[PDB]
């Protein structure tokens, strides 16, 4: 395929996850453009995802620049998954044309799937279906208490600084805050991790502290840290929480599947 000439701006595609990366059974295929995409059937279209074991799939657009494909269900362990986004030479729209192709291979690890159940303040490890950890766990405070539902794990840090300054509470205030944190695994974009929580090892399994992330002790979290992958799932039960949006960028399996195949 060629490509054509345009006084409209091209437009490069980004996949996600990594080439040739293991990823958990709840990583999606993430398909970013650079430019909003005026043409989504162009788009998905040219977009050509194989599986093997053979699964069928769907696509869903969390905003007008990224696109997200998955499974009805979480991947089969051991899946290997092949992404062609052949976009060089696509109209998307408007005079839009797509700047190159990319493709990724991706395979599926263990499956691992970590529930924090607020009735038991337990966070659950299960790995292929057996328990392989038990962690006493403090979620958020009534009052800023961590959302319920299906959050899918994404980057790591072995230190990373926590601070209310950055959604606007400063640090000097009385409920503003500047932490230290060892161990860190988000699994939110809007900002929910697990991680070391030193401060509350004797409210872990007992009374909820938080702002609203997973705290554990240091110990549980360094092993959350070294052993859980991103695309791997935790799932957060009965909290007086909401339910975590399934546009937040990790919050793909929150939306029902007729609502995700419907597309948009
Ligand atoms: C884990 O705890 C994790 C963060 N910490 C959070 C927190 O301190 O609340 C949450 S993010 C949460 C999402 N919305 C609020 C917020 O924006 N509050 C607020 C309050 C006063 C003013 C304003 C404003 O002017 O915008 C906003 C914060 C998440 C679980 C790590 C990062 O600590």
Known sequence: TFQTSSPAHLTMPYVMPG?????????????????????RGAAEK??????????????????????????????????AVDVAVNTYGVDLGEGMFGEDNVQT??????????TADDNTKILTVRVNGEVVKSMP?????????????????????????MDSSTYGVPVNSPNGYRTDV????????????????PWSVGAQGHTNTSHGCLNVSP?????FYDHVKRGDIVEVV??????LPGIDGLGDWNIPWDQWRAGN
């Open 19 to 39: 080439d040739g990366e293991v990823v958990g059974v709840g990583e999606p295929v993430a398909i970013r453009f650079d430019e909003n995409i005026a043409d």
């Open 46 to 79: 040219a977009i050509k995802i194989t599986t093997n074991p053979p699964v069928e799939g769907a696509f869903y657009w969390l905003n007008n620049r990224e696109v997200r494909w998955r499974p009805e269900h979480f991947w089969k362990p051991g899946t």
């Open 105 to 114: 291979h991706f395979t599926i690890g263990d499956e691992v799937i970590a």
């Open 137 to 161: 766990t403090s979620m958020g405070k009534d009052s800023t208490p961590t959302a319920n539902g299906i959050y899918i794990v994404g980057s790591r840090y072995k230190h990373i600084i």
């Open 182 to 197: 060892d161990w860190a695994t988000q699994i939110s974009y809007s900002g929910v991790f697990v991680h070391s929580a």
């Open 219 to 223: 110990s549980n979290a360094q092993w």
């Open 238 to 243: 009965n909290t007086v929480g909401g339910t």
